Amino acid sequence: ASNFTQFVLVDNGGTGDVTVAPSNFANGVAEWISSNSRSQAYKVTCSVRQSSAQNRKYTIKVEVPKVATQTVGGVELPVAAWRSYLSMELTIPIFATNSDCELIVKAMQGLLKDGNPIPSAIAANSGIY
Amino acid sequence: ASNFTQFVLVDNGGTGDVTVAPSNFANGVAEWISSNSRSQAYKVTCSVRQSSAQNRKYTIKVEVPKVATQTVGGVELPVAAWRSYLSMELTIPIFATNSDCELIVKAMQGLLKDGNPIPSAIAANSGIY
Amino acid sequence: ASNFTQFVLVDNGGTGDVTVAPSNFANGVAEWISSNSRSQAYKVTCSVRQSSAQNRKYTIKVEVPKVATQTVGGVELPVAAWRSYLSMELTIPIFATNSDCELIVKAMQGLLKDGNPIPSAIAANSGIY
Amino acid sequence: ASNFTQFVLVDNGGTGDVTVAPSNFANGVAEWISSNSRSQAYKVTCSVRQSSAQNRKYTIKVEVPKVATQTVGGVELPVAAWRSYLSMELTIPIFATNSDCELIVKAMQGLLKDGNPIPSAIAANSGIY
Amino acid sequence: ASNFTQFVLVDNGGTGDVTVAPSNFANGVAEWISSNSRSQAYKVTCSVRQSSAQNRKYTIKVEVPKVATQTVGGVELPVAAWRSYLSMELTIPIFATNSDCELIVKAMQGLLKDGNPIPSAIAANSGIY
Amino acid sequence: ASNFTQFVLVDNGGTGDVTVAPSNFANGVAEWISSNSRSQAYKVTCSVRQSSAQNRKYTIKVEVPKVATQTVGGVELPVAAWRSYLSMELTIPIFATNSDCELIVKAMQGLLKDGNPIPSAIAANSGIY
RNA sequence: AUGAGGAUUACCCAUG
RNA sequence: AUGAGGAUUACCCAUG
RNA sequence: AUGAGGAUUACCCAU
């Protein structure tokens, strides 16, 4: 294959889409970044290694900028007030076949599918109630 | 409303769908398990806490099992050959708007959409290259 | 440009073709793994480093697995009955030009060419005679 | 029958062809040396031995010389400016059938096939990238 | 894309051009070397790290050799009489826009443009006066 | 000669050009500064000294202002958020002739030439990938 | 609070 | 983190 | 750094 390619991170139906493209590959850690100042960019990083003798583990990180009242290209401090951080860690036993892995991916897609509890809770500054 | 409802975790087109439902909320940790014996069930847990003075942190966990029947002491028991674990932590500043949060959700959905680099790598037991 | 890509390790015409793809490149050690169960995958690693003042040293490593199913307690897992390990080390002085290196490669290819003493001895559970 | 014979180590079509011929086979170590000055000759050695109870272990060794003339005191001698050393060790379990071995050989040939990552990296004084 | 491609380092109008190509990416340090023996090659290395919490730092190195043939122990070896070293560090705030960065690049290009003070002084073995 | 003269640092094709002119010569350290408040100016400094008995060394420093959302003449804090710093250090052995030095300058120009990896990486808030 | 730190996964480890 | 600090250049030195 | 040293193969071992 060669999966390290540009892709659409935020899909707003063609118009207003946020595309993130490869920007670094130091130490096997792939990185995609949107076209912004590094302080306001959407950032995605991913890597895999065999955590133990029994498992392999993907470490996926995502950074999403606060947009409401944002000043494009401006200096916005404190940084912690303007950014959200996602840190995923997927552990998969070495016995998992391609099929097993496809199932795992589907489970992840379903977890975040539109309308389901988790995503709708997050999207509303809410918890479970 | 209420968002603590059941949802289909693994969608196999209506037939063979892994649907998970509410099962516990003790200690502020919402739990969903698939309709199986506790030993072979799929598990999803979620919780939100106001970590910093200015951050809210979601902690989500998903467990995908590889169901199997094991003969222990000459008796067959429903068990799991192994489990795949997804542990994710999402940190959102309190200044995030609902619109700002929807953006985070959309990013996560685009991250795992079919065909995009990351889910592709995972499903093929490979890294990004 | 990039040479850290997917390639054919075993060529069985166009069918049994064993392909190994990049998986990780941490600490100057490149790693390729064939698809499906990590437990039954082929592995190839490589690294170069300045061993002494005048020498650079390559460390190639290959693993050929014997695919098999392991049944225990009635639970079967994809495993490798055993593995064949290849560990080679190539030392090349810094005075070697690209031409000198091409020659070294030809020597390695010739060593293992079909019909020659060494490869044919190995292929037949034999030694030299 | 005999596989301890002369063979082509470097194939330069039908001209620069480096041929190496048997020279000695003492203590289970077969040795091939190219013709002319031992000082500027190519060397190849090989041996097999039962490393452990279930493993047999091959130890192949190759030397590629950089032909040069050494003048000292007005006396010139055929020497090797330097040498490139290849030291490989192949371990094969005793359960390996002739088929398993043929596969192992194909893996070795594939590893060094023209155009693939490793051989092409070596041939260019490069590493992986 | 990919930006890890070869490029002409020293342009002598198509004839005698010193072109350098990718050769290593181990440890997050991209390396390019000219098509020579490792001992006489031109070398270019680059790396980026997020130094401060709000800075990104590029570290670039270039090595220009003075090729020579040295007689060591009565044998001739390709070597470098000496080397000229360029070590540059560029610190860019994370708030820098792509446009802000293009400005940095243009400044560096204008800095070394033919006829301008600095490259003039360097090329004449003198200081600024 | 007398190279300490005003020159164009950022060339935007005649219109919008950034010219930097001599502004200080204390301690043999030449300084050029653009026509701005010292906090928002483009600054260039250069000096040469014999670092050791074998080498001479040029120390070139450049400072480039963040322009996006900049407020001309305003007080912008923190300073580290609004400025980029370039620190070049060129070491040249005392044996280098004028010609040798011209080569070194060309190498530097080629390193930063438009379209080449290093400059295009910087100009895109990127690394090598 | 961090960790391309580990897990048997609502637990354990290291450093602010 | 600095250094018109040094190098044999992906290494070493001094001070925040 | 070598070991026709061992390996659960980027570990372990004498010199």
GROMACS .gro file of C-alpha atoms (C1' of nucleotides) in nm, chain D residues 45 47 49 51-52 55 57 61, chain I residues 2-9:
model
   16
  432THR     CA    1   3.351  -2.012   0.435
  434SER     CA    2   2.975  -2.471   0.825
  436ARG     CA    3   2.648  -2.776   1.333
  438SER     CA    4   2.377  -2.573   1.808
  439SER     CA    5   2.112  -2.703   2.047
  442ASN     CA    6   1.842  -2.645   1.617
  444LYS     CA    7   2.301  -2.361   1.275
  448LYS     CA    8   3.113  -1.588   0.597
  808U      C1'    9   3.557  -1.125   1.758
  809G      C1'   10   3.327  -1.576   1.947
  810A      C1'   11   3.198  -2.270   1.267
  811G      C1'   12   2.932  -1.912   2.155
  812G      C1'   13   2.346  -2.012   2.322
  813A      C1'   14   1.876  -1.817   2.219
  814U      C1'   15   1.155  -1.734   2.369
  815U      C1'   16   1.609  -1.360   1.842
   0.00000   0.00000   0.00000
